[PDB]
């Protein structure tokens, strides 16, 4: 479970903090939301694929940024991450991802598949309880009101999905704040 | 998930109130602990098999009680329930059960399989999170307990099973059987 | 079965059984690396070769960069070692425990290579049973030898209720 | 796991008291040894089949004893129990059994399969750790034993099966 | 079937001499115990994997002894043999092995899996009738044995495995 | 493993005394040779099917003998046993059988399948090591034998099957069918 | 079907001359016994694997004999053939083989599997009717035989396998192998 | 393997006497040709099905002959045997059969399947080596044969099937059926 | 279906000219005699062409023509190197050398067999039956032609895949 | 292989006489065309199902004809045979059938499936080579034919199926007015 | 479905113009007949394999020319045969006229070359060859064989579900 909400003021991301293999909870504290620089990503699936994609993307974000000195935007990093997922089509990174940032064009939110398909959409959820959470979600918002909408939708997914626990990490992309 | 704890002069039963088919919770309030009269049962598995077994056993407890002028002993109702489970071995009632009561011989607690095997034991758990809950019971066990201390032990073990089993959850029903009353 | 408790205390079984038959009553599943210790469950040969590879590459890092390796660094290294062989995964779930200048650190590793930081954990067959005991009695302000006693109670519960675990249990204090 | 030992006048039975479905122990106290009169039986497998076979055989032991007025001989109850196992060949009672008693012919010990094959042997074990336990019996079985020395032999063999078979591993009763 | 017994003065190994594919015995004389110096190994499984492992390990024991001036230790040859088993994990040498030797640290006995897991234990058995034979060992095992009393214990345990295992019988191979 | 040898003097049957499920021996003493009275049978396969077929055939031998006052022809008991095996074709008695007796027509030896096919033959073996044992019989069998020479041939052939078949055991049971015993 | 018998004098090999695919005989004359010079091999299984192993081993026998100036010991050719079978474990030569020769150590007989396991034994049979034929050998063998008496034992055992195995049949190819000469 | 040859003198049947389960011969003397009186049958397949079909057909031939007081035509016994095979379609008698006899209409030879299909033909073979044996028959067939010349043709065809089929061979049983 | 017959002086080969995939005839005129074998047509055609090239190979280098035994061992190795993906075709190889008439049977694995009379393919069972009835070692070339016509005609009447 | 041709005067049926199980011909003379009375049937599939259906239908034709004094209209015998095929849906008679006759309504030709579906048509083929044979029928087929010209069309179509189908390898019966 | 008919001194080719995946027609106009200079080919199967074989063969015809029908057929048999592991899933008809005379050829996805006159290929080929087997002549004219190809293809249209609605014809008289 992971939720992104697109506001005029920015992009809000939030996801669970639970990992369970099979029917058994291994950890009540597994971070599924990660911040780099200005952008936040958060996804669901196997944790190791998501963690290595946060680390690979952090390296190559620094690659372009030390090369150009003009920080990358959201679309540029999205197409990069779509190619990184797509080159390994034979052995796919088993993870659906949400990519969120704010550019000079405006706030941008992105949906990525394990094959590497890039989708623009305003509001989205990804994972086990995503069905339930998008139901709660189903254009003129504020950043902290969208936080409260994300808490309501994530709380609904907690009550009705067996794989989504607590944690409910919240992250606010602004152009203005960490 | 369902837990029975045997105390000297009393049996404590407790189980979840959560039903989920697949990966999706259909109901936050599904009763898995039932009282019959003299005695109480609680099990885990498919809900419809458990409910029809509460109803069939309720009927035949009244059958024995109206005829033979003696009240039911827990061993007699257990052997009856083992035969009812065992006659339908070809199409088994998919449910593991805990049978709890108090007779003149003393407190009695019973474990039942879908085939119909009867086991005498002091403490037991049944279902998805039973592994986790018996762990808590295996830490804190004495033969010399009180009824309300065993209530708190059942709350601790069921709370551990809530935090670490995906199939268990929201709510806990507790039936308390001292020799005097059953509430 | 293997248990880590963050105060870091690690403890695991010493029993190996293939199928329904015990081959050995003395199979070490806890290994020392200086001020580090790991312990895991699964196939023994994957765990032993991972103790040996990680010992070599800890010495690799320590001889080049001239300081003691961070537990996070050895964990991220071990996640890559598990992850490069995704086609033929090292069939073993691992617990990584150490103390750095940032503080005590405990880590959970999967055969794919996912890194998790948690306070208390168990891994293996009887882990379900053992985490139950830990969930009943764990909070954040413990001492090292009281957590040893908690690990003896939790591992003993897993001995009585898991067919794959039992016999003796190793205990390490970090 | 269940062990029978034949002594020149007397039969010793012993078995586990642990039931585990899958990799998880449901009960530390599951009776697998039963008494039916002057003699007794004990087997391994599914518990419900064993319990209903103790009860059915108990009923029909009383059947023969009431109607024919003489007592069950152990060969007669064994051939009866082989037919009870054999009529249900389509849906077999999933349980291997040890039948032990003493007749005027002498001590008699019997092995029964879920199909219903009857075997008379001196020493036997049945179940998961039976392989291990029969090893202990083959080291130290001789035809001239006493009852309580064979009790100690049964404790040694069952203790070996406890340490090297993951199935059971609790108290062991002795008949 | 192969049995190792650890005594305070040394290590005793013993195994079958029977090979049967399917339900049919091809040979009444198939050696499954091999001597490599002061090192005995003996294992069970496919014979060709065991035979090629005796020859490869014999070569590389000579490799270490010629290059690294000292003689070789049993822990070193065991870790070597674990790596040899582990490099071929994709196509595993289908054989469970017992590695036995004596070093200056003392008597050492070792169990190896086709994946390559190394285990130190006092007494062990490996193969079809190993279940039966370890039963005999679990009955009367003392840490304080003599070499020839442990020989007689190995004969009793191997004889039990002969009478109750269809795959192992009529073999007299005892190494120390 | 079970061997029948047809002599002019009579019929000799012999079989193992070993039962092993899987790779593990359950019993060193499992009787696979049974005498019905005038007749003797011995077969291989599942033991429970063989034991219940000895008992059923013993009952129906007594059935025929009490109603007809003629003793049973070995051909008659064989055709009866073929029908008993054949009626249960859906759930076959998993056992190959050797039927041996002596009639006024002479010595008769019979092979039965779990389906119920009846074969008359001089020498035969049935079971796991039967392949090995028939080799010995195919080397050194004659039509003109004596009863005790065929006993020694059966010990040689059964011992060869013991040494080269993992299912066969040490137990050896010998039953010579010739008017007496 | 192929039979080797170890005598104090030498080693005797004999096998069928019948090939049948499925339930149908393609050839009444298929040689399954081959001489390599100074000794012989004979096996059962797929014919093409056996034929290419006779040719490969003949080449590499000539390889060893032209270099090292000493003639070949049967143990060396056996260990060589075990490695040749073992290198192709992924695609095994589907053939069980009997390797027979006489060295200065004495007469030597060898059993080889498609994986490449080498077994030393006195008497052996390999193939479909090997079960039957080893039965005859297990009844009638002794350690003190002569070469031509062991020939007669091989005829009896192969004749039993002809009468009781569907995959074997008419024709027999006996080798007698000695230090002095080699007979057919 | 079983061979029937239709002559305008009589019907000749011949088949093997070998039974092998798997790759191993159980018996060198297993009768697969049976005579029912004036006529005879012979087939291949499982032996127990063939033997019980010889016994059932023998019983019901006596059934028809005792009630109707007249001899049995081969067409009638063939249609009877086709119904007996066909009623048990769920659990088929696993056996292909050759039915041969002579009626007042003339010599008659019949092929039966385990389902129960009846075929009229002159020459036929049934079983493992039947392919080989019909080859010999397809080379040396004539409508105008004698009884003993067709015997030699059956020996040649069965001998070819002995040399080229692993499941057949050993001895050969022949029973002439002129009148 | 393909038949080779070894006579005192000469080898006679004959085979069908029918190809049917499944239950349906695609062609009434498919040449299977060039050597002659049965199986998939494309494997046989490329083996006639490859062997023709390498027959010309040996003849242009070594002053002396191929002996039929040499071309058979060559063709056995060509079949055997591709054991992983076998040329799905059973072949009959027939020629005359100075040693005498030689006839050869080849499997898709590459096993070489020397016999007198042989058949290969669907109706080979039927045709070998005819050969087993009426063969002698002392035949003439044109009498063996008539024997091959009789055996192939029996296989035509009794095999659905030939014609 | 079996072919029916509907002409304005009568119905022509023709089929093979070859039975092969697997890849091997058991018989060069296996009748797959049967005459019942005023009319006839012919089908393809398992021979035993076809033979028992000819015999059952012959019995019940005599059943209807003795109780009702009237020979059966082909539609009535077709609906009967469709019910006979349909009652045994659990264990289907594995055979596709062609039913041909002439009534006072005119010439009638019928196609039957093992389930029991009845189809009215003009020209049809059934079995292995039916694909090939229907091609010949589809080439030039007028509604206005004569009986013996349709015989030659059936010989041409069956001969095409013989040359191009391995399972086939001719019995033809004419049915016009009251002269078979 | 595709039909070639060999007349006196000319090859006539004709095939469908229908493509349907599954039970659904995607296109009523899919060209399955292609012309290459002095001659032409037409086949059935997967369309992409046939189209890439027309283009590859066109390239190598220009390669050799910078021609006989037997040579281009043996080339196409080798092109089909080199890719035996991943076969071009397409059965082809190759038709042309050389100085030896008119030549018609059948190719399999393995690459077997067969020389014959009239012969269909594809789904309805069974039906269409039936029409051809009825009105056989070795002595035909080019336009009478056109009418025979239209009759046979029309029969295959009416009785095959994977054929019809479009029919293109190439004449290799010139």
I-interface mutation test, from J17, J22, J24, most I Cβ less than 10 A away: J24
**Is F70 strand, coil or helix?**
coil
Residue K134's nearest CA partner among G156, J154, D21 is J154
**Half-sphere exposure of residue I52, counting CA atoms within 13 Å on the CB side?**
8
Resolution reached, in Å? 3.7
Residue J65 CA to chain centroid, in angstroms?
A: 22
Residue contact G82–E51, C-beta within 8 A? yes
J43 is written with which tokens?
């089908």
Residue K114 CA to chain centroid, in angstroms?
A: 13
Inter-CA distances, D36 with D18, D97, D153, G130, Å: 21, 14, 24, 53
DSSP state of I62: S
Quote the minimal CA–CA distance from C123 to chain B in Å.
13
Within 10 angstroms of residue K120's Cβ, the number of other Cβ atoms is 31
Residue in I with minimal Cα distance to H164: I129
Quote the minimal CA–CA distance from J143 to chain I in Å.
30
Which residue's entry shows tokens 């130290």? D140
Q: Are I58 and I22 in contact (CB under 8 A)?
A: no
Breaks (C-N over 2.5 A) in chain C follow: 7
Q: Choose among D86, D113, D124: nearest Cβ to F52.
A: D86
* Alpha-helical segments (H) within A71-162: 74-87, 130-137, 143-160
Q: Are G138 and G2 in contact (CB under 8 A)?
A: no
Q: Are C29 and C36 in contact (CB under 8 A)?
A: no
Find residue J98's DSSP bridge partners. Answer: J42, J111
* Alpha-helical segments (H) within chain B: 47-67, 74-87, 130-139, 147-164
**Is D21 strand, coil or helix?**
strand
Q: Are B40 and B182 in contact (CB under 8 A)?
A: yes
Between CA G103 and CA K23 the distance in angstroms is 74
Residue contact H23–G166, C-beta within 8 A? yes
- Whether A1 is catalytic: yes
* J contact chains, 3+ CB pairs < 8 A: H, I, K
Within 10 angstroms of residue I128's Cβ, the number of other Cβ atoms is 27
Between CA I163 and CA I126 the distance in angstroms is 13
- In which region does residue F113 sit, left (phi positive, over 0), alpha (psi from -120 to 50) or beta (all else)? beta
Within 10 angstroms of residue F44's Cβ, the number of other Cβ atoms is 23
CA angle H122, H127, H128 (to 5 degrees): 130
H179 domain residue, yes or no: no
B-interface mutation test, from C119, C132, C137, C138, most B Cβ less than 10 A away: C132
What positions of E carry a catalytic annotation?
A: 1
Which residue's entry shows tokens 């004359």? G29
Contacts of F24 in chain D (CB under 8 A): 131
DSSP letters along I100-140, please?
EEEEEEE-SS--EEE-SEEEESSTHHHHHHHHHHH--SS--
DSSP state of A90: S
Contacts of E126 in chain D (CB under 8 A): none
User: Do chains B and C touch by CB distance (3+ pairs < 8 Å)?
Assistant: yes
Residue contact D164–C125, C-beta within 8 A? no
Radius of gyration of the CA atoms of chain J, in A:
16
Inter-CA distances, E83 with E49, E80, I149, Å: 15, 5, 67
What is the CATH number for E51?
3.60.20.10
Longest Cα pair distance anywhere in chain A, in angstroms? 48
J64 is written with which tokens?
């209807």
Residue contact A51–C115, C-beta within 8 A? yes
User: Do chains K and A touch by CB distance (3+ pairs < 8 Å)?
Assistant: no
Q: Choose among I128, I134, I154: nearest Cβ to H138.
A: I154
Contacts of E29 in chain G (CB under 8 A): 119-121
Contacts of D134 in chain E (CB under 8 A): 132, 135, 160, 164
Q: Choose among C21, C125, C161: nearest Cβ to D165.
A: C21
φ, ψ (nearest 5 deg) of residue A7: -110, 165
Quote the minimal CA–CA distance from G52 to chain E in Å.
21
Inter-CA distances, H124 with G110, I153, J170, Å: 49, 17, 20
**Is K170 strand, coil or helix?**
strand
CB neighbours of C46 closer than 8 A, spacing ≥ 6?
A: C90, C91, C92, E115
Contacts of F121 in chain H (CB under 8 A): 27-29
Pairing of strands D40-45, D95-103: antiparallel
Residue H41's nearest CA partner among H60, H64, H20, H19 is H60
Contacts of G52 in chain I (CB under 8 A): 76, 80, 110
Q: Choose among H82, H115, H119: nearest Cβ to J27.
A: H119
Domain count, chain C: 1
Q: Are D103 and D74 in contact (CB under 8 A)?
A: yes
CA angle J109, J112, J117 (to 5 degrees): 115
Inter-CA distances, H24 with A129, B10, G166, H164, K29, Å: 63, 70, 6, 17, 62
Q: Are I113 and I29 in contact (CB under 8 A)?
A: no
Find residue B45's DSSP bridge partners. Answer: B95
Q: Choose among G138, G140, G164: nearest Cβ to F138.
A: G164
DSSP state of H71: P
H157 is written with which tokens?
């065809």
Inter-CA distances, F134 with F18, F137, F146, Å: 19, 5, 19
Experimental method: X-ray
**Is H95 strand, coil or helix?**
strand
φ, ψ (nearest 5 deg) of residue H157: -70, -40
Contacts of A28 in chain B (CB under 8 A): 163
Residue I117's nearest CA partner among I135, I98, I142 is I135
Between CA G184 and CA H104 the distance in angstroms is 63
Residue F164's nearest CA partner among F117, F132, F127 is F132
Residue C47's nearest CA partner among E86, E121, E57 is E86
DSSP letters along chain J, please?
-EEEEE-SSEEEEEE---EEETTEEEES----EEE-SSSEEEEEE-HHHHHHHHHHHHHHHHHHHHHHSSPPPHHHHHHHHHHHHHHT-SS---EEEEEEEEETTEEEEEEE-SS--EEE-SEEEESSTHHHHHHHHHHS--SS--HHHHHHHHHHHHHHHHHHBSS---EEEEEETTB-
Residue contact G118–E51, C-beta within 8 A? yes
Contacts of E132 in chain F (CB under 8 A): 24
Longest Cα pair distance anywhere in chain G, in angstroms? 49
- Say what the alpha-carbon torsion angle E125, E130, E136, E141 is, to the nearest 10 degrees: 20
Within 10 angstroms of residue D102's Cβ, the number of other Cβ atoms is 15
B-interface mutation test, from A23, A29, A133, A157, most B Cβ less than 10 A away: A23
Cβ contacts below 8 Å, chain H against chain J, sum to 42
Between CA B116 and CA D47 the distance in angstroms is 8
E-interface mutation test, from D1, D124, D129, D135, most E Cβ less than 10 A away: D135
Which residue's entry shows tokens 């005394």? F17
- Chain D residues within 8 angstroms (CB to CB) of chain F: 82-83, 85-86, 89-90, 111, 113, 115-121, 124, 131
Find residue K98's DSSP bridge partners. Answer: K101
| Residue G92 structural domain | 2-183
**Is E108 strand, coil or helix?**
strand
- Say what the alpha-carbon torsion angle B45, B48, B54, B55 is, to the nearest 10 degrees: -170
Residue contact C118–A49, C-beta within 8 A? no
Residue in D with minimal Cα distance to B119: D30
Q: Is the dihedral of CA J134, J138, J144, J148 positive or negative?
A: negative
DSSP letters along B1-35, please?
-EEEEEETTEEEEEE---EEETTEEEES----EEE
**Is K71 strand, coil or helix?**
helix
CB neighbours of B23 closer than 8 A, spacing ≥ 6?
A: A128, A161, A162, A163
Q: Choose among G90, G117, G121: nearest Cβ to E47.
A: G117
G84 is written with which tokens?
């040749």
Residue contact E128–F23, C-beta within 8 A? yes
């Amino acid at each position: 479970t992971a939720i992104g909400i697109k506001t005029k003021d920015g992009v809000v991301l939030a996801a669970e903090r639970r990992l369970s293999y099979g029917d058994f909870v291994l950890s009540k504290s597994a971070r599924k939301v990660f911040k780099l620089g200005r952008f936040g990503i958060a996804g669901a699936g196997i944790v190791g694929d998501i963690q290595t994609l946060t680390r690979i993307m952090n390296v190559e974000i620094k690659y372009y940024e030390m090369y150009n000195s003009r920080k990358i935007s959201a679309r540029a990093a999205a197409k990069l991450l779509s190619v990184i997922l797509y080159q390994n089509k034979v052995l796919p990174y088993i993870s659906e991802l949400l990519f969120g940032g704010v550019d000079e064009d405006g706030p941008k939110l992105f949906i990525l598949d394990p094959i590497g398909s890039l989708i623009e959409d305003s509001y989205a959820a990804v994972g086990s309880g995503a069905r339930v959470a998008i139901g709660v979600l189903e254009e003129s918002l504020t950043s902290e009101a969208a936080k409260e909408l994300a808490i309501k939708s994530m709380k609904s997914a907690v009550e009705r999905d067996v794989m989504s626990g607590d944690g409910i990490d919240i992250l606010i992309i602004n152009k203005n704040n960490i």
